[PDB]
Design a protein around this ligand. Sequence first.
Ligand SMILES: [Cl-]
Ligand SMILES: [Cl-]
Length: 111
Amino acid sequence: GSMYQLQFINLVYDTTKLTHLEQTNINLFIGNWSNHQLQKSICIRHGDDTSHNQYHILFIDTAHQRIKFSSFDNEEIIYILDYDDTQHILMQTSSKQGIGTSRPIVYERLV
Ligand SMILES: [Cl-]
Ligand SMILES: [Cl-]
C-alpha cells in the first residue's frame, strides 16, 4: 500500500509544573496515530527546548479530556485534540483571531 506522510508534534512543557491530573491528560495523546483518508500519521511526544517540530500547549482541559496547542512557528493556528479512548483521539483546528472551529477528524492509534 501507499506510504503516509508523518508529522511530528513535540509538545514542549515542564512536567514538574503540572498537576498529576494535567500530566494524565497530556498522556492520553502521546503516541503514534493515523488517519486513512488523509494518508497522514502524527507522532505526539513530549519534547524539549532542543527539539524540532515544537508545539506549545495553550490549555489542558481536565474536565473534558482535551488539549489545545499551537506550533512554535505560528501562534494563530490552534490545534485541539479530544480524547475518545485509548485507541482514538480527534483533531480539530481553530484559531486565535479567526472565525470558527473545524469538525473533529478521528485519528486511530497505530497498534
Ligand atoms: Cl496493500
Ligand atoms: Cl523545526
